Design a protein around this ligand. Structure first.
Ligand SMILES: O=C(Nc1cnccc1CO)[C@@H]1COc2ccc(Cl)cc21
Ligand SMILES: O=C(Nc1cnccc1CO)[C@@H]1COc2ccc(Cl)cc21
Lengths: 304, 304
């Protein structure tokens, strides 16, 4: 009973957080095995962030300039390299708390948990979606750079995001763990356009299924629609066009509830065209798109 | 930049979760030092839950009937006692992962994080408020009993909630860590009235301050109100009456933003009387009451 915006338990990731300091800049690093990963802009001053030449800035740094600390534990840096927008600091000690892990580049519309950190110390955990425009709407202040996003599949942490920047619009941008930005962003203090964003249709439908499962059913109607008709409505309301691949991933929810995917699309069509009429769905007065169909299945079945 | 419903990092609590089995019933326990705490209904069958005589049911149980497991680790039970609605199982080994901790009974309107667990394994973490009627609107399925709610103040975990029951309305009830229920509830399968609930006014005001801090300002107006006038509106809309104690705790947010508490009350008054007019505040289309003023200060300053 009930449905919440749930994050993965963060313990496995907390054990990996370290503080990295280079010169006067301090941010967070991720210590996995004998490597610490962090945003390459740890090597910049504020003066450098205008248009940093990272290759030249890194050439002025030696292993001993990267101060890495995990609480009392001071790590000895024996190598450094830049890969895209991340620095990889080789340390002489493998992290004893390294969980089973993978580095994954997530697709837009997928969800993940963020462990917000400051000075290498975890402050909170929240779940969010990678927007279709490759930004995330997080909660990050100065010092949060290097905080990571992840998913967990039994004992394996799949790291998918490392925080780098807040855009002038207040939304967030970052990279995968190989240092490649999600979206068109560059690690420089310049105003940068985030694309037109859309609502993640398949996630809204998944959440409507979660609502029916939990007893919020008022939005179910006597109608049906087609993918074509539904996509005309999706385009009008800036929703992602629904494909057969999205219908296929909604199969388990359709099977469990007995509500055909296109019938749920007709409920979503009516909600887009008429609004919620002052009512709520799972405690929300808007259509929620931060739950994937897999998240709904996991939460509704009790997966650990 | 940004404001999210953030939970505390759950690692310190994950290290305390164990599975407790008595007969055919399995639920979660909390292993702190050499004691495992769990709901006393672990000693019931479904047949017993109608009107259990817990004293008589526990008399039929010996230490060896309580099977406590923490992954591979099997714990040896050397004592058992019932305190209110919790069982305390003394084990021969202190939990090496016991964090610094306290047991606290929270007040209605306070917030905390829940680590939802099944079979002693953590599945997710979310933040919620203890409703003014002493229920919580969580996400719990069968097997989640014994999952705990907590807050963290630097290195100290204050445990405040242990999950026991889902009411027929789909809301949740549980106890403090001394086994005293929050609210009028009893651990028996009988339909039980949860009181009339109200919206946590001081938390809505705190969240409006968080909104202004983050740039959502459209709801600020040219008006002011008084505590008396505001409380007539609060009563009409089923909000908690605002007191000077609530105004006092909003002091830091008022000081930081320069918006007097009674001016923010006039914005809240206009939102109650006129609705949101199809607009949103911090990504919500309703007035959010699950952030306390302390939560807003912590999140807006970056506390670890
Ligand atoms: O954005 C930043 N930090 C930040 C991140 N998240 C949240 C807040 C902040 C600073 O208030 C810094 C300041 O400007 C740049 C430009 C490029 C990069 Cl890669 C990083 C930064
Ligand atoms: O409520 C329960 N479990 C539960 C909790 N949270 C979520 C779901 C469930 C079961 O679906 C069980 C079944 O009925 C009773 C009556 C009294 C108590 Cl103390 C416990 C229980």
């Amino acid at each position: 009973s009930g449905f919440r915006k749930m994050a993965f338990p963060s313990g496995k990731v907390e054990g990996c957080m370290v503080q990295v300091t280079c010169g006067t800049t301090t941010l967070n690093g991720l210590w996995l095995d004998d490597v610490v990963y962090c945003p390459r802009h740890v090597i910049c001053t504020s003066e450098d962030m205008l248009n940093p030449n990272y290759e030249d800035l890194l050439i002025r740094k030696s292993n001993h300039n990267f101060l890495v600390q995990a609480g009392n534990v001071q790590l000895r840096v024996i190598g450094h390299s830049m890969q895209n927008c991340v620095l990889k600091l080789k340390v002489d000690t493998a992290n004893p708390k390294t969980p089973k892990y993978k580095f994954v580049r997530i697709q837009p519309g997928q969800t993940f948990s963020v462990l917000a950190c400051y000075n290498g110390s975890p402050s909170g955990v929240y779940q969010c979606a990678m927007r279709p425009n490759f930004t995330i709407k997080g909660s990050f202040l100065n010092g949060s750079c290097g905080s990571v996003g992840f998913n967990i599949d039994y004992d394996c942490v799949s790291f998918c995001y490392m925080h780098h920047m807040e855009l002038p619009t207040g939304v967030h941008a970052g990279t995968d763990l190989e240092g490649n930005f999600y979206g068109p962003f560059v690690d420089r203090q310049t105003a940068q356009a985030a694309g037109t964003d859309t609502t993640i249709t398949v996630n809204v439908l998944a959440w409507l299924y979660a609502a029916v499962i939990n007893g919020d059913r008022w939005f179910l109607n006597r109608f049906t629609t087609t993918l074509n008709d539904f996509n005309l409505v999706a385009m009008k309301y800036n929703y992602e066009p629904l494909t057969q691949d999205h219908v296929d991933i909604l199969g388990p929810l359709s099977a469990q509830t007995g509500i055909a995917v296109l019938d749920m699309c007709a409920s979503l069509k009516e909600l887009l065209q008429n609004g919620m009429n002052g009512r709520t769905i799972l405690g929300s007065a808007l259509l929620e798109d931060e739950f994937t169909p897999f998240d709904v299945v996991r939460q509704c079945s009790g997966v650990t």
